[PDB]
């Protein structure tokens, strides 16, 4: 019967729940007691970018760590310049509802997300001075939540019908379809070697896929509510999720289990974005209690909160040289802290 | 002004770009957005067959119809077979919510289960929408359509198989009015929003006049907060 095969699954679930306990001889907070604290980290609003007229929904830095795309729900997708506050391009979107954006590693393309589940790819360094659509990647059935770029020809889009997909761009088709979730996928992020990628779903589950083959290598269920944001430790051996449990949990990829949760008892609102700093010491996190707390990533204590936003904090990003962080809020201002 | 010859031309672009957002934010904020909720079979595609002026977009189809110099925008969220808790905050700041309930759903049972009749199904859909934390100051236009189908069904099948404690007669005027006040007793927020119901027919032309009369209310009520009277 159906229960006869599901009893094997609960036994296999009891196998892997047994193996993680056989390895956790001493947690993170007992092995790094003999470290110095990082001290208070106060960061001043160096720039502020005030072009949009709606809620900023996502952002992404270019890998030259100067340009910066930001996408709001008034149907605009503005490519800022972070050193001097300039708008390089203002790309008018076809569908005004945009739930994510992502900039190219080469600096050539930019792809809006969408609530109309079509991940349209824009071309920047083009002839004729425009920014026209390169290709619209229809084929999901839900909505779209986070779509990072592998390179200029492969884009990994999470969706809202529990299917993370990998597209080609010279042709419009998919190549794989990473299925295996139950609640809809809310965010993803690629490893620094772009061979693996994690994806935080809505059933308190985060799965480490692989890009080539297309199967889930490991799953990580540690939360209670949905996982709302995800990011990598900058070597690709650990990743931290963010939830509506107000708890950034730092997992890893070679010991299968959760290393540390970053909980504070005074915070009750969710997490919307998580981004590690470079060298992986300062885990930033953006709650929707209007703050943006800055957690040490090896001891669970806090540091200087980045207050200053009059609404939610919807997107973060540390530049690839680790220089600045920029937060995009639900009032229209981005603030490039430093 | 300590800037190079090209960088002086760069901020000339970024104030010509900034001019084309502030002269476009003053075009979208003059126009009225309208979420269009309801069940997928409850006459949802009929009320966009009233006035329609504007295949890949399987998620959200817009309808940019206008009336008496007012560019409305209806957002049919029909293709979203996903969790409403994750994208409904995108629609915070909508001007009014056009909800729809087929009036013939009192006796018509749900498809997947022979229980939780579609009037009770649409009521619990309406209670989650109306009392949502993102929709407080947004009024709810509620259409009761299929009213040319309802009044000849209650003549031959009673209403009390949907509501257990009705205790009333079986005319169209007194019973459909009970369903109408059945929905308006669902808001815990009584004075921060006002449900403008309506019994629209399938053939009449009066509902687009009605939705203009209920947007002119909530635009006025959105202006009383900004001017300081309310």
């Amino acid at each position, epitope marked *: 019967e159906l229960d006869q095969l599901r009893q094997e699954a609960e036994q296999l679930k009891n196998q892997i729940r047994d193996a993680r306990k056989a390895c956790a001889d001493a947690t993170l907070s007992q092995i790094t007691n003999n470290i110095d604290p990082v001290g208070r980290i106060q960061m001043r609003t160096r720039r502020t970018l005030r072009g949009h007229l709606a809620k900023i929904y996502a952002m992404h830095w270019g890998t030259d760590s100067r340009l910066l795309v930001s996408a709001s729900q008034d149907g605009k997708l503005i490519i800022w310049d972070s050193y001097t506050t300039n708008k390089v391009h203002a790309i008018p979107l076809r569908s005004s509802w945009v739930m994510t954006c992502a900039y190219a590693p080469s600096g050539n393309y930019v792809a809006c997300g969408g609530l109309d589940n079509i991940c349209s790819i824009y071309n920047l360094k083009t002839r004729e001075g425009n920014v026209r659509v390169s290709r619209e990647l229809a084929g999901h059935t839900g909505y779209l939540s986070c779509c990072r770029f592998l390179d200029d020809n492969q884009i990994v889009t999470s969706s809202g019908d529990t299917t993370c997909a990998l597209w080609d761009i010279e042709t419009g088709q998919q190549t794989t379809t990473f299925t295996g979730h139950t609640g809809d996928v809310m965010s993803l992020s690629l490893a620094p070697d772009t061979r693996l990628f994690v994806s935080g779903a809505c059933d308190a589950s985060a799965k480490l896929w692989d890009v080539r083959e297309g199967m889930c290598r490991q799953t990580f269920t540690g939360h209670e509510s949905d996982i709302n944001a995800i990011c990598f430790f900058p070597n690709g051996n650990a990743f931290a999720t963010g939830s509506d449990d107000a708890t950034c949990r730092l997992f890893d990829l070679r010991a299968d289990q959760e290393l540390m949760t970053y909980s504070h008892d005074n915070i009750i609102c969710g997490i919307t974005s998580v981004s590690f700093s470079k060298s992986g010491r300062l885990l930033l996190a953006g709650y929707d209690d209007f703050n943006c707390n800055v957690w040490d990533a090896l001891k669970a204590d806090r540091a200087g909160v980045l207050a200053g936003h009059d609404n939610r904090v919807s997107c973060l990003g540390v530049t690839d040289d680790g220089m600045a962080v920029a937060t995009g809020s639900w009032d229209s201002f981005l603030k490039i802290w430093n | 002004c300590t800037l190079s010859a090209e960088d002086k031309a760069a901020v*000339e672009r970024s104030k*010509m770009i900034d001019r084309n957002l502030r002269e476009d934010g003053e075009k979208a904020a003059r126009e009225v957005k309208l979420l269009l909720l309801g069940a997928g079979e409850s006459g949802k595609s009929t009320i966009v067959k009233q006035m329609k002026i504007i295949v890949k977009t399987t998620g959200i189809v817009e309808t940019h119809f206008t009336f008496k110099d007012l560019h409305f925008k209806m957002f049919d969220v029909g293709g979203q077979r996903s969790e409403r808790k994750k994208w409904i905050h995108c629609f915070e700041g909508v001007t009014a919510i056009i909800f729809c309930v087929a009036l013939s759903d009192y006796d018509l049972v749900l498809a997947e289960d022979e229980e939780m009749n579609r009037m009770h199904e649409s009521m619990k859909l309406f209670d989650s929408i109306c009392n949502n934390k993102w929709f407080t100051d947004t009024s709810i236009i509620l259409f009761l359509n299929k009213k040319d189908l309802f009044e000849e069904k209650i003549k031959k099948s009673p209403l009390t198989i949907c509501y257990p404690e009705y205790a009333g007669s079986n005319t169209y005027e007194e019973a459909a009015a009970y369903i109408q006040c059945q929905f308006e007793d669902l808001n815990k927020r009584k004075d921060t929003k006002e449900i403008y119901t309506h019994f629209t027919c399938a053939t009449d032309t009066k509902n687009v006049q009605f939705v203009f009369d209920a947007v002119t209310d909530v635009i006025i009520k959105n202006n009383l907060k900004d001017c300081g009277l309310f």
Partner: single-chain antibody
Amino acid sequence: VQLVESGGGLVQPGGSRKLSCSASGFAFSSFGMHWVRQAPEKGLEWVAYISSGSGTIYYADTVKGRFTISRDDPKNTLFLQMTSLRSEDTAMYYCVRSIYYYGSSPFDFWGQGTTLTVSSSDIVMTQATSSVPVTPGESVSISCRSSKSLLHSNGNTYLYWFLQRPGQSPQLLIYRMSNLASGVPDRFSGSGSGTAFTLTISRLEAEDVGVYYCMQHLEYPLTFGAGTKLEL
């Protein structure tokens, strides 16, 4: 994409002639147009400029006040009206385009060029070479020394190199410094020093013949150099 232009012919001095540049193929309203002339024995000199949306208009010193410029965005045409020309304005006039943001490539596409024939504080750029002979295969370098320090205070050394194959219209080679334009091979590579510059060709073939104008862009008026000819 092209910028065909018309006008000119033969004009009596002191008169006037309206020069039109009908730019068809792109989005015109985002392109700050210039106007560069070429005397029939001399190099290139800058003449005019109008920014995007007709906001900022500069001029050269020689043509200040007597040359007026205008843009027509819906008619998609660019107008240069010349009042009371002298005999020192007989030249081929080029209608070039340029868009200015971070990481752009100004002066990228140059028009075909019309002829205008008459009847009878700024930074200088020298080019110490003139008319070098070169066989295909030898790595040749072209020097171009400035006078002011072209390195600004944000890392940029605004020195746009160029090329002009004989007969035809010029084209970009190297924008700001050691950046390649869209569609040039990897043989051309520049290396700067703030005042002294060098355009290195690693390997070269028979299509790379012509003159090589180095042009600054640090402040208006932007002066080309007297370019070095390449022969066989």
